[PDB]
């Protein structure tokens, strides 16, 4: 019954400062602590630091004094800052909270935020092109048809893809993105539906690329053969 909301994903230039915020809701009968953790893509978890109820902090020495955790003006809002970043700092950053009953009795890592991917790069953001993956008899297996969207040429990750504004979830497969030689990502999202529904139901893929403030809705029209 605790929720942690983190700020959006995006770019940080090398040597510059990464800045993230976390809002912790749901604690009422006790104070709480906030731990910060990161996860490089395809790697494990690394603990960054903690902010105690009174505002004091503890940091991982591996971060070489480049880290700061502060309490913001807004109730339950915390800021994580990491200075002089390099490619080693590219990761999904998480905040995690737990009940603090007293200094001699506290929990940790009980509730986690969704995680925000921060990419360290000197490159500019680039919004995706969204192309239909049109259904046809080449994608139609005995009463079921496959269709989708190709989300191409964007930077940095991530992108979110929904179908029919979230009304369509069954049979959806959103694939891991691939990095092309251009340095831009390409991702596909597919869905299997009854083929009889193709002439009576509209299928739209909703693509959001938060780093570039790009939102694209693409109607996927069937082929005739």
């Amino acid at each position: 019954q605790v929720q942690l909301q983190e700020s959006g994903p995006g770019l940080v230039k090398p040597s510059e400062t990464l800045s993230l915020t976390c809002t912790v809701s749901g604690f009422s009968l006790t104070s709480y602590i906030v731990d910060w953790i990161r996860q490089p893509p395809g790697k494990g978890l690394e603990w960054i630091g903690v902010i105690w109820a009174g505002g004091s902090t503890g940091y991982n020495s591996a971060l070489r004094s480049r880290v700061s955790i502060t309490k913001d003006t807004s109730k339950n809002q915390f800021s994580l800052k990491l200075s002089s970043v390099t490619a080693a700092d590219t990761a999904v950053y998480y905040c995690a909270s737990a009940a603090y009953y007293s200094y001699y009795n506290y929990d940790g890592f009980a509730y986690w935020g969704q995680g925000t991917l921060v990419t360290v790069s000197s490159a500019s953001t680039k919004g995706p092109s969204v192309f239909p993956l049109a259904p046809s008899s080449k994608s139609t297996s005995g009463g079921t048809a496959a269709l989708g969207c190709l989300v191409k040429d964007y930077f940095p990750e991530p992108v979110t893809v929904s179908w029919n504004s979230g009304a369509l979830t069954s049979g959806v497969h959103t694939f891991p993105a691939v990095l092309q030689s251009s340095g831009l990502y390409s991702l596909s999202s597919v869905v299997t539906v009854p083929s009889s529904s193709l002439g009576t139901q509209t299928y739209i893929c909703n693509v959001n690329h938060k780093p570039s403030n790009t939102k694209v809705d693409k109607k996927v029209e069937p082929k005739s053969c």
């Binding site: 092309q180 390409s186 005739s224 053969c225």
Partner: protein, 219 residues
């Protein structure tokens, strides 16, 4: 710093069978207050880790009793008495007795299910993309098991090399299958110069390779 070693790195297990994950620390995790700050988490693809166990053996709210934790000092174990399809993912152990707090490297739990042949689908490039000077052809291998699958692109029966990329979903939490998407990228000129576009699929569930193809300009 305290080193946390998880064993094994990969854990394939038959549905309904037990699973055991080991976590070993380079130093005792027993704190001066008599408590052992050892935790277990489960992380699903594209999702945050979720806590299962704290204080070695205490289950978090909503965690079913097929999950259990044991151990003391430096040796710890996460047990699943009867593995279910939804138990797939990466399990991590964590210690917070010592500063800095450190995690184990993770253990990926996989379901060993019956062989399922993939359903193969092909998609031509869109006219929208063709207008930009590029042509991407997509081949989808849906809901197969095991993970091992070979995709070969053929353009007018000529085997393609260095112009395709693919990715595979993590194991499905309901049916225990994988899906694979492969993209073949050509210039519009090369695309317009050829007729037949095919993706050849080799998998254990298939007695012979399955070729899914289309002819450019049929409709």
């Amino acid at each position: 710093d305290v080193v946390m070693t998880q064993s094994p790195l990969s854990l394939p297990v038959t549905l309904g069978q037990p699973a055991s994950i080991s976590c070993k620390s380079s130093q005792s995790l027993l704190y001066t207050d008599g408590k052992t700050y050892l935790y277990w988490f489960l992380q699903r693809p594209g999702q945050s880790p979720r806590r299962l166990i704290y204080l070695v053996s205490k289950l978090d709210s909503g965690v079913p009793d097929r999950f259990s934790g044991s151990g003391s000092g430096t040796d710890f174990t996460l047990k699943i008495s009867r593995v279910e399809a939804e138990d797939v993912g990466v399990y991590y152990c964590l210690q917070s007795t010592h500063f800095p707090h450190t995690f184990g490297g993770g253990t990926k739990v996989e379901i060993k299910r019956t062989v399922a042949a993939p359903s193969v689908f092909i998609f031509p490039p869109s006219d929208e993309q063709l207008k930009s000077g590029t042509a991407s052809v997509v081949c989808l291998l849906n809901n197969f098991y095991p993970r091992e699958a070979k995709v070969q692109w053929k353009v007018d029966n000529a085997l393609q090399s260095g112009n395709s990329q693919e990715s595979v979903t993590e194991q499905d939490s309901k049916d225990s299958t994988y899906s694979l998407s492969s993209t073949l990228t050509l210039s519009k000129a090369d695309y317009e110069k050829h007729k037949v576009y095919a993706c050849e699929v080799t998998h254990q569930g298939l007695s012979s390779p399955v070729t899914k193809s289309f002819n450019r300009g049929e409709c």
